Short mmCIF file of C-alpha atoms in Angstrom, two decimals:
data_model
loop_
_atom_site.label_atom_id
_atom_site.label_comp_id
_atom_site.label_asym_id
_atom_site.label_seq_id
_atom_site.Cartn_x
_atom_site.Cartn_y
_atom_site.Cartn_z
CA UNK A 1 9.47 12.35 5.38
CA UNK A 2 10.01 11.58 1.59
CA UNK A 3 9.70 7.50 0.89
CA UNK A 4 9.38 5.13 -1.78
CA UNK A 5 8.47 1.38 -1.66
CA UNK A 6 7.65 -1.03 -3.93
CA UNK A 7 5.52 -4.36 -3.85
CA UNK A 8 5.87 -7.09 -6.35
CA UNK A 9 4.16 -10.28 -7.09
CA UNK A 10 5.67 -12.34 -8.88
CA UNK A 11 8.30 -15.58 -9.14
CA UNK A 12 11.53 -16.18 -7.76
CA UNK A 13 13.90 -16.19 -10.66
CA UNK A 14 17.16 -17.05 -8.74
CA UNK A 15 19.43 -18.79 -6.03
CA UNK A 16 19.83 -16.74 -3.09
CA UNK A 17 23.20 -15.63 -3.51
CA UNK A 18 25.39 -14.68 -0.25
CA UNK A 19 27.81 -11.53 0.36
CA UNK A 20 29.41 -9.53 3.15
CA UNK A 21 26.69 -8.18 8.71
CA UNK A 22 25.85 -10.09 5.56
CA UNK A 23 23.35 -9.95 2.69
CA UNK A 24 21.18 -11.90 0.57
CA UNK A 25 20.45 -11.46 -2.81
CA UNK A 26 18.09 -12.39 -5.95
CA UNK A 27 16.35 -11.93 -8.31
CA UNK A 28 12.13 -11.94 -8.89
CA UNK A 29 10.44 -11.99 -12.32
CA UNK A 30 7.34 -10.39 -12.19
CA UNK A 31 4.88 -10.61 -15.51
CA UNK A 32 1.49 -8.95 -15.25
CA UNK A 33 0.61 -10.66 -18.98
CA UNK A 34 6.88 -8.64 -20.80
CA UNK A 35 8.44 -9.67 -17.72
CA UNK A 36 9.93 -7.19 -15.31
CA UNK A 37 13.10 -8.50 -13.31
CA UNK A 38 14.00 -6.88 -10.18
CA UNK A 39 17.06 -7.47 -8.00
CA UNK A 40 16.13 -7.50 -4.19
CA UNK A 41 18.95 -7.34 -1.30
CA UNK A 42 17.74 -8.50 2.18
CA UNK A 43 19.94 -7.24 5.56
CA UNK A 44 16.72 -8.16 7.80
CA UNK A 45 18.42 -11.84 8.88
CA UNK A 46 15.05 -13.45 9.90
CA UNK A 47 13.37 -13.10 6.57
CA UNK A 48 17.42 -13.89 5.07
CA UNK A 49 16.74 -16.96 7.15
CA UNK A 50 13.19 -17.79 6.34
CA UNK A 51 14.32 -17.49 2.75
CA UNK A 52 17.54 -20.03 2.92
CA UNK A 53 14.99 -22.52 5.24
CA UNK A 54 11.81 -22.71 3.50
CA UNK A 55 11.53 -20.61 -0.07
CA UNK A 56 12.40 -22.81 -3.17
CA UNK A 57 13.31 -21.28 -6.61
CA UNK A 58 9.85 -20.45 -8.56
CA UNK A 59 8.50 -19.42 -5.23
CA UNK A 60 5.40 -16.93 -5.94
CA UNK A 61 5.91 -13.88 -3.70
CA UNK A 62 4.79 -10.77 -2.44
CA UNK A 63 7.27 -8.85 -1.20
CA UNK A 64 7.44 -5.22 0.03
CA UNK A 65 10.81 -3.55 -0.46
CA UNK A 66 12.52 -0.06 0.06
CA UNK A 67 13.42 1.45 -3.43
CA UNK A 68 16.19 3.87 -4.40
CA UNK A 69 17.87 5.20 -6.80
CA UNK A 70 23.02 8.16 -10.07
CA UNK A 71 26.42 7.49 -11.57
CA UNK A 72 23.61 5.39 -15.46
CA UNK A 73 20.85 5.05 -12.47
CA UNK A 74 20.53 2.28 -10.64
CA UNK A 75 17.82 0.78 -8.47
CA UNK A 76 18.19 -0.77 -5.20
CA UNK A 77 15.19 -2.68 -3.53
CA UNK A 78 15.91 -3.59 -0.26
CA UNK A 79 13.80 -6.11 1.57
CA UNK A 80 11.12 -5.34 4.30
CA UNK A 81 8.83 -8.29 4.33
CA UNK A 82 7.87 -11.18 2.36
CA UNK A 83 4.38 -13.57 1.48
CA UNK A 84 5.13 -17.08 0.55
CA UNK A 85 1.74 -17.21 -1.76
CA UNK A 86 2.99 -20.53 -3.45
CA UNK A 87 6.31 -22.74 -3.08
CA UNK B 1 1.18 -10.71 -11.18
CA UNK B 2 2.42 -7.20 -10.42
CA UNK B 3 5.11 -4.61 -9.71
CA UNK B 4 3.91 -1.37 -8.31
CA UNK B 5 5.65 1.75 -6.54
CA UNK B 6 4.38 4.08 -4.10
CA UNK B 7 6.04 7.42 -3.60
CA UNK B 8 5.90 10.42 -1.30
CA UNK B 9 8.59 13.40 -2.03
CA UNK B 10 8.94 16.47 -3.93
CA UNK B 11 8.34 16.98 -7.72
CA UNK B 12 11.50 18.38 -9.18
CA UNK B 13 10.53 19.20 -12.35
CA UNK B 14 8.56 20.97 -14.98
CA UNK B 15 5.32 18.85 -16.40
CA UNK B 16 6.69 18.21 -19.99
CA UNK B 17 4.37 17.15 -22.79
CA UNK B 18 5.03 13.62 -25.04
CA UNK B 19 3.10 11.78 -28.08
CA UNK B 20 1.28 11.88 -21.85
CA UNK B 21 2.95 13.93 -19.48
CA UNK B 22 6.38 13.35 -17.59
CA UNK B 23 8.28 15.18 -14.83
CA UNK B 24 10.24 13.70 -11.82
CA UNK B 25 9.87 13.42 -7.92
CA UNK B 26 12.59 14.45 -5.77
CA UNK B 27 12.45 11.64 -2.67
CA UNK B 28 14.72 12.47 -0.06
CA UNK B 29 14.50 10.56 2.96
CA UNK B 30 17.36 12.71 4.97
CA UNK B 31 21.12 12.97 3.26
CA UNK B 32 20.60 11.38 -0.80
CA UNK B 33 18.21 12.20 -2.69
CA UNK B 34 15.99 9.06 -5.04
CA UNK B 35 14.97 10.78 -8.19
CA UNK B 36 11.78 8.80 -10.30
CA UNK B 37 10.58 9.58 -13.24
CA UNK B 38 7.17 9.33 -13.53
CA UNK B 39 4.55 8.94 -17.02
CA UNK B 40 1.34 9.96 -17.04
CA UNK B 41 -1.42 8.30 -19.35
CA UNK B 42 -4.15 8.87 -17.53
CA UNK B 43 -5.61 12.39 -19.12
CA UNK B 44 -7.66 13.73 -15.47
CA UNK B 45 -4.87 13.19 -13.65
CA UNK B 46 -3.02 14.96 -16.73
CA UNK B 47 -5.41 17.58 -16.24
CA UNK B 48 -5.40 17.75 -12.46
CA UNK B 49 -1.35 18.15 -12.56
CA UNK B 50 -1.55 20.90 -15.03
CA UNK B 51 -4.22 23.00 -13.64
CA UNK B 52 -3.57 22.43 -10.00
CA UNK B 53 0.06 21.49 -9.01
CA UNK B 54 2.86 23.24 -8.85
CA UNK B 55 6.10 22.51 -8.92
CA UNK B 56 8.21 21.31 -5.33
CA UNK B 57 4.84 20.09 -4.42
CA UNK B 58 5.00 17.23 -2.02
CA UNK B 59 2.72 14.68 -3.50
CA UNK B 60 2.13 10.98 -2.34
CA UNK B 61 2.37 8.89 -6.05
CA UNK B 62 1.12 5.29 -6.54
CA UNK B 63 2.91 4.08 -10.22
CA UNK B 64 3.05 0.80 -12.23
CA UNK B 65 6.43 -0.24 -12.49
CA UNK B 66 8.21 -1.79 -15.31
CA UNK B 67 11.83 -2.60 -16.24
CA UNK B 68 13.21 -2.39 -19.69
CA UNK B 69 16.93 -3.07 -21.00
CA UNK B 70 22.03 -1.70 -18.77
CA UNK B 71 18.56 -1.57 -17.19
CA UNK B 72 15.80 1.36 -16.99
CA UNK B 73 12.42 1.51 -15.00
CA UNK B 74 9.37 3.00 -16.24
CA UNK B 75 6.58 4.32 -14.00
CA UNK B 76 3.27 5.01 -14.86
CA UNK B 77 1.50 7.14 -12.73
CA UNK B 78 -2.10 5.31 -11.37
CA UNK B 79 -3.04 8.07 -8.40
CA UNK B 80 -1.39 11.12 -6.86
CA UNK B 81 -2.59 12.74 -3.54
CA UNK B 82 -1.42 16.22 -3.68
CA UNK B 83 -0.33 16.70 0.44
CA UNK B 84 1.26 20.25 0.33
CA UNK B 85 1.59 22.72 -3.00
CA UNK B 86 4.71 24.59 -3.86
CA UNK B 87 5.78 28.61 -4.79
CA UNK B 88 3.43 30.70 -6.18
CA UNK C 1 -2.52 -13.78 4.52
CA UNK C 2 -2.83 -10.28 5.78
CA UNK C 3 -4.90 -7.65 5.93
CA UNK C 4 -3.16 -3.80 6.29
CA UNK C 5 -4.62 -0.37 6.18
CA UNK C 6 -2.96 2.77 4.89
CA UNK C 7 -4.37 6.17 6.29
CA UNK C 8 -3.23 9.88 5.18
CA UNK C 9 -5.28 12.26 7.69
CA UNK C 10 -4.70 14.23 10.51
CA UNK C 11 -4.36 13.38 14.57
CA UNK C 12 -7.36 14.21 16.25
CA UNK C 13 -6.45 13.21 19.54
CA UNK C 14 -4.26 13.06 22.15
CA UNK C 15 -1.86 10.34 22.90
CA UNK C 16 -3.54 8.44 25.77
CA UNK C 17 -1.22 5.54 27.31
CA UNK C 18 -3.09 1.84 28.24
CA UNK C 19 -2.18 -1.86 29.29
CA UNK C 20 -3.46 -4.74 27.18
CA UNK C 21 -4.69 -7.61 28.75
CA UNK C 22 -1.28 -9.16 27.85
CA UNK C 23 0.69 -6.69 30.10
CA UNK C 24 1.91 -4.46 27.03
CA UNK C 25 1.76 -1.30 26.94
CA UNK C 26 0.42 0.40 24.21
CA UNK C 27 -0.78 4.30 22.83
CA UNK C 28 -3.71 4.98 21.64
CA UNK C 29 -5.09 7.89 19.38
CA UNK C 30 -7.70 8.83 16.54
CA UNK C 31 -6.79 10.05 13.37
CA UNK C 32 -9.49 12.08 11.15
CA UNK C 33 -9.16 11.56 7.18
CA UNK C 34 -11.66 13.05 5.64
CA UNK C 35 -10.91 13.12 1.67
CA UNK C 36 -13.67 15.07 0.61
CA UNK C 37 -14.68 18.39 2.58
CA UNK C 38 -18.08 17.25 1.00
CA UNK C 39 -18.06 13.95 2.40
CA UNK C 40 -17.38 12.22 5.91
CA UNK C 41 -14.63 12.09 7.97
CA UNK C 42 -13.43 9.06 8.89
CA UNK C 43 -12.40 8.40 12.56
CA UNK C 44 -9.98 5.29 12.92
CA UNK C 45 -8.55 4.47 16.17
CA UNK C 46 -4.76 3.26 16.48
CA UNK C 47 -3.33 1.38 18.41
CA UNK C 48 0.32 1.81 18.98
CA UNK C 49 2.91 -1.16 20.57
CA UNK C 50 5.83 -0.39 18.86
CA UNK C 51 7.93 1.38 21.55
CA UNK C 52 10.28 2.93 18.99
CA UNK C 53 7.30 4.62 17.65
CA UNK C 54 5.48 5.17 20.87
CA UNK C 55 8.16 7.14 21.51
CA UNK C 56 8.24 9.05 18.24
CA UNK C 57 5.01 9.95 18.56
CA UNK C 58 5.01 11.03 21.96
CA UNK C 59 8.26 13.09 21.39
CA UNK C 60 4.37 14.70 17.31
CA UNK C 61 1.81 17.09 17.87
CA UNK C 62 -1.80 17.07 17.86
CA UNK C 63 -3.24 17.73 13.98
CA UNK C 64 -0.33 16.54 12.28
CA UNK C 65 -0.79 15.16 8.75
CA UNK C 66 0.57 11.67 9.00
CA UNK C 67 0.61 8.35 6.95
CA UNK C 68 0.15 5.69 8.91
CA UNK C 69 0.18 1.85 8.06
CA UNK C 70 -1.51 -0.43 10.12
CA UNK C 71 -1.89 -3.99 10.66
CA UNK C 72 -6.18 -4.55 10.96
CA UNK C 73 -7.78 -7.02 12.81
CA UNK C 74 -11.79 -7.24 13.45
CA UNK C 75 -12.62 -8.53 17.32
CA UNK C 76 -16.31 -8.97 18.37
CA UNK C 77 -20.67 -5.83 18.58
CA UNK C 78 -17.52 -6.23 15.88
CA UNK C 79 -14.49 -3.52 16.10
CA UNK C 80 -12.10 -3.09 14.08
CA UNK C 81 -8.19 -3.13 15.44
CA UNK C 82 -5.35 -1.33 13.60
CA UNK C 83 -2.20 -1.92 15.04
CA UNK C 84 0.13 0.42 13.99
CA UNK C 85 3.24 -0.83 11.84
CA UNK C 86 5.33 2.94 10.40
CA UNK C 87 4.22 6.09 10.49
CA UNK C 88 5.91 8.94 8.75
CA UNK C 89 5.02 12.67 9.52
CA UNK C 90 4.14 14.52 6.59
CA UNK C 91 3.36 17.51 8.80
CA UNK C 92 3.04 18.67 12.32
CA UNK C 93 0.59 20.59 14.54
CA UNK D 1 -6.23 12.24 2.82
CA UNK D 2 -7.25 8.51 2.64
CA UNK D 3 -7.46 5.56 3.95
CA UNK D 4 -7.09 2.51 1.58
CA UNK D 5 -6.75 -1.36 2.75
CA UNK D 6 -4.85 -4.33 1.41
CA UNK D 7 -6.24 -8.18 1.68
CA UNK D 8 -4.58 -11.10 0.79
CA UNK D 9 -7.56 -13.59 1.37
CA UNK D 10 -9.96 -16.02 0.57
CA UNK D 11 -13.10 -15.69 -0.80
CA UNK D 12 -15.68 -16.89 1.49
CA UNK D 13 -18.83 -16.40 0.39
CA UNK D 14 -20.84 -16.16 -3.16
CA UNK D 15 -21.19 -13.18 -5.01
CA UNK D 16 -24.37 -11.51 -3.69
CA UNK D 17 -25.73 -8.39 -6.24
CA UNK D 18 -27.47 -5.64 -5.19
CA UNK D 19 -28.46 -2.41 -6.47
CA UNK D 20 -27.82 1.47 -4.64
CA UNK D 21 -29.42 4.34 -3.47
CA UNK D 22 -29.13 5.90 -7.41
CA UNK D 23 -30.78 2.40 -8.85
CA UNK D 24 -26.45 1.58 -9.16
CA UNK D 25 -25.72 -1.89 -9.18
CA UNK D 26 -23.27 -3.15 -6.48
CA UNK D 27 -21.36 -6.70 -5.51
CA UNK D 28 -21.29 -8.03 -1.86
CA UNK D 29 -18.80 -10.88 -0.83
CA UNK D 30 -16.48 -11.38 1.68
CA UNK D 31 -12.92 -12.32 2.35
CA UNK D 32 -11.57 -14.23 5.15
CA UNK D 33 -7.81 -13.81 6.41
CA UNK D 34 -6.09 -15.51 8.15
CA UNK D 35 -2.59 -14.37 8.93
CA UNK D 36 -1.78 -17.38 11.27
CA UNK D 37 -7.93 -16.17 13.83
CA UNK D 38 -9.39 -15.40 10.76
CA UNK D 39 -10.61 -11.83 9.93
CA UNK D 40 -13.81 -11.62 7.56
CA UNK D 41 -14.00 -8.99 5.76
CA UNK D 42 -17.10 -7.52 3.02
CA UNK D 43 -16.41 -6.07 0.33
CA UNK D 44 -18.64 -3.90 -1.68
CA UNK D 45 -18.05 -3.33 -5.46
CA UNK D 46 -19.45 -0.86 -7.95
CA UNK D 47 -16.53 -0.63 -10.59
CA UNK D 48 -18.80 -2.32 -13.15
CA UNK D 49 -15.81 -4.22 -14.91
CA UNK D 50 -14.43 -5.56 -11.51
CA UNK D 51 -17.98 -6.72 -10.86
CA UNK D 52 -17.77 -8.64 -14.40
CA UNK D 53 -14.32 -9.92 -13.64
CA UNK D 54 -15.39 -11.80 -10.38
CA UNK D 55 -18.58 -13.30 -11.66
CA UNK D 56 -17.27 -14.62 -14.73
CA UNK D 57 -13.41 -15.51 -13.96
CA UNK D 58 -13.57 -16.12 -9.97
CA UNK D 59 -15.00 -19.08 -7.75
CA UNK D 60 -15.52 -19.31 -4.22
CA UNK D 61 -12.33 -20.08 -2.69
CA UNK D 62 -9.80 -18.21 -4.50
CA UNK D 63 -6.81 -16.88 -3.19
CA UNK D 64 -7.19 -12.58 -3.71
CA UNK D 65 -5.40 -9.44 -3.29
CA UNK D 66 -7.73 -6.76 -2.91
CA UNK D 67 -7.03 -3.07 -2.47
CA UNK D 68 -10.19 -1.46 -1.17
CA UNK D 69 -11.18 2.28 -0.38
CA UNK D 70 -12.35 2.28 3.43
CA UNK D 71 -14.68 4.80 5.09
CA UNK D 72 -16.12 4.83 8.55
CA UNK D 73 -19.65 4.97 8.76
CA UNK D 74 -21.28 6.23 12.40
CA UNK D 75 -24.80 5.23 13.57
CA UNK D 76 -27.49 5.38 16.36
CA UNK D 77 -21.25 2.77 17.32
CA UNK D 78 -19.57 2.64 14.00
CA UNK D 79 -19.45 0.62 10.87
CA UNK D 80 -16.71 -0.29 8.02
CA UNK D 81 -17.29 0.51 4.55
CA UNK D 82 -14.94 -1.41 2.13
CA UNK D 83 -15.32 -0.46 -1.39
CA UNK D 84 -13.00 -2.41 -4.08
CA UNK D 85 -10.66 -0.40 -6.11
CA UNK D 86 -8.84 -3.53 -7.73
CA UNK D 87 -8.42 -7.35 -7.72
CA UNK D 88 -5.63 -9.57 -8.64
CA UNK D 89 -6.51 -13.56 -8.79
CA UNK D 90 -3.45 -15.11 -7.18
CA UNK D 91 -5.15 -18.94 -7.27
CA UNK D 92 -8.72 -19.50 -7.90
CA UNK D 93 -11.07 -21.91 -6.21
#
């Protein structure tokens, strides 16, 4: 079957930001020199947990996350799993 | 620091010619359907989608991912595996 | 830390059904990915706990392409372990 | 068909040079991970600039992410070929 996930290293830009079966959500900046920002959600509620417990803003990551895409296009990256490189 | 994409799905589209190449896989888990488009620098891989692949081709893509400003995301193609070809 | 292999190739076995030592149990199979037709072709042994996908599988057919992802482990001789994490079939037998 | 591997590890060993079949010059070192046991890993390198890249940037010790080509290699019981396709320094040594 068709897929398409992405994995990022880079820095977490943002507080983890709460909504409503709730999600998390924010933000990484990723700069492989121009610095890429991409919005993650997160359903799985262990890592929404291990996030809220242990990961600080500025976190280094490396996170895996299920991408998709109409209405404008917008991208949705939806957590799988996450690396706390550095705190 | 990085931000890459890997892809399997379908390409949709023609292989149209820039001053690199673009065209656009059709992923479609079930159902909606996650359309990238993908750039292509990298002249034998240019070569290899020209001469070999054929459109609706399913094709596992490995891209570098970038995100420029209302927000856009550019993917530049680093490896394809061609899995199955399409119409002849 | 982690260490995780992706494989596109084809099942060359059948599904043959184990315990572990821990009481689990757990699939086994082979898959064959050879990328060259010129070159070798690699045998790597999975190892399958994941009862969602112990099922899946034994609801797929021998020769299938598949992409599998694997958790990999070396144990000591030295073998190496790949414990099988998704697997998404590309085509069947 | 392939079968690629991802490491996040550390470098455990100096960077021990070589040279192939073809006269080719190669890179040996290894990688230990540890996810929580600690898999070792060797890594082979030809890509000339990676080669450069780890003996003039990287020390002993540093904190990688390796993607590396695998292959299977049978003899006489079977042995792991991992051949380095890219590096990314997340903290060096």
């Amino acid at each position: 079957m068709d897929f398409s996930k992405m994995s990022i290293v880079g820095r977490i830009g943002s507080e983890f930001t709460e909504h409503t079966n709730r999600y998390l959500k924010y933000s990484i900046a990723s700069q492989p020199r121009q610095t890429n920002w991409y919005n993650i959600t997160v359903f799985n509620e262990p890592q929404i947990n291990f996030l809220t417990e242990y990961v600080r803003k500025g976190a280094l990551v490396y996170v895996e996350a299920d991408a998709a895409n109409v209405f404008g296009t917008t991208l949705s990256l939806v957590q799988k799993d996450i690396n706390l490189l550095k705190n």
